[PDB]
Paper text:
Intermediate- or high-resolution structures have been determined for the immature capsids within a β-retrovirus [Mason–Pfizer monkey virus (M-PMV) (4)] and lentivirus [HIV-1 (4, 5)] as well as for virus-like particles mimicking an immature α-retrovirus [Rous sarcoma virus (RSV) (6)]. The general architecture of the immature MLV lattice is similar to the previously determined HIV-1 and M-PMV Gag shells: it consists of a hexameric arrangement of Gag in which curvature is accommodated by the presence of multiple small defects and one larger defect rather than by Gag pentamers.
Immature retroviruses are built by the Gag polyprotein; Gag is then cut into domains, and the resulting CA capsid proteins form the mature capsid, which can mediate infection of a new cell. Murine leukemia virus (MLV), the prototypic member of the γ-retroviruses, is commonly used in comparative studies and as a basis for retroviral vector design. In this study, we have determined the structure of the truncated MLV CA-CTD by X-ray crystallography and have resolved the architecture and CA lattice structures of immature and mature MLV particles by cryo-ET and subtomogram averaging.
Author numbering:
A (entry chain B), B (entry chain A), C (entry chain A), D (entry chain A), E (entry chain B), F (entry chain C), ...: 19 to 218
Amino acid sequence: GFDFAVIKELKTAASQYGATAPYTLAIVESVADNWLTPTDWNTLVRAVLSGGDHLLWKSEFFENCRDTAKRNQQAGNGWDFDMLTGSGNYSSTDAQMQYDPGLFAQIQAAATKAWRKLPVKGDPGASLTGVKQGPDEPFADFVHRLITTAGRIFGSAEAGVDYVKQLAYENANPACQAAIRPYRKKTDLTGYIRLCSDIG
Amino acid sequence: GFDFAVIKELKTAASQYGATAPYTLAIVESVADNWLTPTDWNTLVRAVLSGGDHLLWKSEFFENCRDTAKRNQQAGNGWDFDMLTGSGNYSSTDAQMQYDPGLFAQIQAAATKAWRKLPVKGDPGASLTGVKQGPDEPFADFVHRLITTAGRIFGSAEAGVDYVKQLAYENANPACQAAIRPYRKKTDLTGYIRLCSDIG
Amino acid sequence: GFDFAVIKELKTAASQYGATAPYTLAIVESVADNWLTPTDWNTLVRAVLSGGDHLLWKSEFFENCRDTAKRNQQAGNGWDFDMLTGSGNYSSTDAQMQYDPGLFAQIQAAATKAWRKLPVKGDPGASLTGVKQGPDEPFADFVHRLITTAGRIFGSAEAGVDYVKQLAYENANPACQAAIRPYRKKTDLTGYIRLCSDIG
Amino acid sequence: GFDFAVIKELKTAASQYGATAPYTLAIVESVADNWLTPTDWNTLVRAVLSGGDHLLWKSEFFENCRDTAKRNQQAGNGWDFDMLTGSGNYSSTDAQMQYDPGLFAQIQAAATKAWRKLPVKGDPGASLTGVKQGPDEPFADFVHRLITTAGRIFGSAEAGVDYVKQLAYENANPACQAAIRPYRKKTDLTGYIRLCSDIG
Amino acid sequence: GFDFAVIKELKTAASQYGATAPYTLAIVESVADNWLTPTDWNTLVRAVLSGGDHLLWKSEFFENCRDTAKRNQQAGNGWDFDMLTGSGNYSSTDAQMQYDPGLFAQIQAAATKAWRKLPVKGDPGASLTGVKQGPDEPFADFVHRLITTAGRIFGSAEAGVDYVKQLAYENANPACQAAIRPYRKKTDLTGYIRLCSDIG
Amino acid sequence: GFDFAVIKELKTAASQYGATAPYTLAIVESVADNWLTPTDWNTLVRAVLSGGDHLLWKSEFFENCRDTAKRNQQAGNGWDFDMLTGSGNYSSTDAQMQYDPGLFAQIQAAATKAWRKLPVKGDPGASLTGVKQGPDEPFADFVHRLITTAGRIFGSAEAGVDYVKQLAYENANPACQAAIRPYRKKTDLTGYIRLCSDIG
Amino acid sequence: GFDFAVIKELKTAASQYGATAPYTLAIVESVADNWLTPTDWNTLVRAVLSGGDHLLWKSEFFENCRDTAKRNQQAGNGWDFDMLTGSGNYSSTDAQMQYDPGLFAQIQAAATKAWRKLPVKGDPGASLTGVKQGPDEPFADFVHRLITTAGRIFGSAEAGVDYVKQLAYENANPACQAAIRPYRKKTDLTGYIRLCSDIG
């Protein structure tokens, strides 16, 4: 089916998380769940994504998939042109929907393979390590935001380290961080959540 | 074909990088390139991997793939039992090799889908952030090792940050780090490669 | 097949590890993988091993296996003499190879049962607890050697204890141990690998 | 024939020298020596190179070469579609190998023309002017490396100038450069090779 | 067609830039655009160029092109003598114009291949690094001249470096350079264009 | 008709003004006035412009225009392939000129729609806010240049503001600006044109 | 037969020794040992050598050898055109191999005569008299290198003279030469080999 808003949302996450974050490809493959055409899949993506990424993925589609077609006719499928074009001649919606289910397996695998291929820019997440917690904002909630998105981008929650500790420290508001740095070194989450829980 | 050593190597990388590092799944899908049986694929993996991971992936194989079979017979493939068991009745090597190429697409997609599913433990890389550069070891080569594997695990080379700077610092030998910390703060790779290039 | 060198190697390990170390019986059963004659198995072992061990195992073979034959003819196998002698009358290589596969199961089980029976001397590993690390030798590599072989003999890596700590200590070179004992008590592997990493 | 490693090597040189260094195009035209298909030539290059470069060169291939086809049919060749597509309809390996030798001349000229067209990024060589000679590394060998690669990139050995002299100076180790700068100004290669030839 | 003046101009650029500067071969291949005879091409070049270069290129023409003819008759072109002489027997203008278009591809490729081969002297550009800006001449325009021609010869605009900075410095008039050297070190183009913009 | 020089000129303005300045699209649509082929329009633009921009615009041409073709055949035009390819099969110049005038309306609208789509880099005008008036150059003429081009890029003459006042100030020569800043704050164009009108 | 590497090696020696050193012509005549075509001999040499040398030798070949042909037909050989062209009409490999053995004598003599004719530049050996022994390098081995190559170029080992003595002296490292010059004048090889045999 046509996913509209969640597509927009993953595009937003793609610009913040990058088309490499376990998040993004997880959602990719999640949407790939449905028997549907790569044609509109890719029109959709080039709508959210930017052109050359798209057309490159689809050109490598043509190349590798028609090599697969070589193999398929070595095995003798008798296919690979029309659907395995994205749209060959009359793939107008349903005429493309005429997929073989194993042909659907092929097309879905190829689309996700493509999407898997091309590299992201390489720097959409800097915000994570960046400025701080907002001063008025609650601290532990900010830290929770931090570790959750750090798992999102780093790929695991188990990135937490004195690196992450001083990341939160610098990111804490001047009040809370100014309490923590004189508080102790080797200070753990319990100390922070204990201390800075007020407004004043 | 039977990949032996590189399989061993990815298993080693899986215990160090984890079955989440872009490295590991990249190699997974790279090996998935060949028309072959998921049966020996999975026997291989359960040989390198540990059992429950394997049999769980293959049970979810059965479940989701026989739902796919529901759909396939809604479309009317007339298949999904024998090959889409891993081995149904007489999948003895070649009799399994009797795959439909679209059936191969399905099985490869399902295997990689499974492997994609289950979570790693969550902490095979601690060594990265860990002890140091060896004292006798050359420093810049160590740093190169660091950023390369940091890209391996973090998923991008663009993790480098004053975090990574003090990571190298602590990791540098007492000589080089003892030169760098008095040297300057805000010190970049050029400074390190400049300074500590000797033996004495 | 004829394993030559690895047999020699396990014999070496048997004199150092003893025919009790999980290592040795693991390799025993690993070699037992093949449909082959206990005859040459045992000629091989008595070649590496020493006679009375061998002939005793094979005498208990005769005894328990011919009791098994009692049972087999209670069930009525109609066998147990020729092959279940090791060589009865014309077991000359292939004529012995005429094994029943369930007969092979029996013979392999009996051979490994025998090998399992007789006791080792009781002291081939003293070297482990013994003299030291060589002075010029690297320390942490020595310690790694220590814990690996300690797992080999003790049967688990989880023998490591302040016992093992002072074992390494005494075993460390006079330099490193003379650094460690004044360094601290309750000192862990991190401390050792940290300190003694040099040559001078 | 299939050049594998040297292709990898020129790709490495392309990232260091750039697809403009006399080196790179010299090797390009050197490989172009053989009667072979631009199809796999270009698949190869897009394998080493990055996509848009490739497909752009091949699109301009289509454009200019089909203008050439205009001319060819003004002269009346009766060709330019199938081979002069890269693969028109059945250029499957040998069916493409069905080239006319003058048609091969055309295709080789067109491929090299394309490759000649598109511009490099513009900065893969900075290393040349960059950090230094390694301190332990021998100096004159480093200088030799310098002038050789300077010829590689600049296109001639006759770039050597007091620019290059102070380039080597800065690049020399602190020992050798600290000897040379007090040594003299207007110092030539003979002076450097004379002075810094030791270890200490 | 007969290019007269631009040929003269590239010859001038060849004596200043050398028959290696991306400029010169770019113009070479640009003129090669037309279906025409290598005969007058080469008469033209030996008119601008100097003899041995020419006749050497054309001798290697004969050699490599008649090896190509070997191959062509292995493929069976049935040609290579008359046109693939430059003029065999009756190549008098139009009778040479009787080229096959694939034969034209061959001849153009061969001519440009030749021209590509032979080496320049090795030092036509010294003027670039040389004397200075004229004193009365405007400085920034001179610098623009510098970087443009430096791109011409070096092959890229990205040669600009403190080398090029002191090149302009020395090249600046005594007034402007005498202002700049006391002005600052690490001075960029903005500083120069800012300062020396006057006459007095 | 073939516009040559003005095309070059708009390309120059595109690199200085950007393909967003009201100037550039005004000229675009001005040239679009003529019944002509998008084919050569786009060959022209990709000649001045850079490839991916072009081919992207034309790919979106294919996509949206063949959706328009969907609609056209819902209305039943019976067209959209050959001309609405840019060149389908025999669009060789006149055979493309066989456009329907409403088909020309479509193609012109599509071409300008494309050109309208893709984004400029985002920074070709910095010169505007940049260095200054040349010292010898007349001031008010420079200011006139400023406001005219500021209208060109900003899209209106009504950008003039104390921002623009200090822009001219900084841009004025040291003489004139050094007269104006002590002259007054809130100084208008009349003051500047009054004061700095001399040479000395 | 095709000598590849040794040809490369003599070319290297030709650039260092010059095509006059007894070495080079000795190797020339050594290779001339085989009944083979001067055609590929000369293609080979012009591959290692540089063109005008080659074609000049072969032009004088034509001249003197066709004078020899004058004489041959005064004696009435009835030959000298085809083979005594290098390749007359159908000297394609074997058809050239159709040499008369006395004709081979003629062609070999002519080729070596040519090669004997033309003069070397006149200065490829300066290195010999040049910089020094490397400081770390062993001295007597360096001296051995010296006299061996001095025999190579000078044509005899009996060049050794107080000239050669001070050549080695200057060439000795500062240590050894600084020992020798105060050691004695009229010092012979025995003194040097005696003294400087150490490292320190």
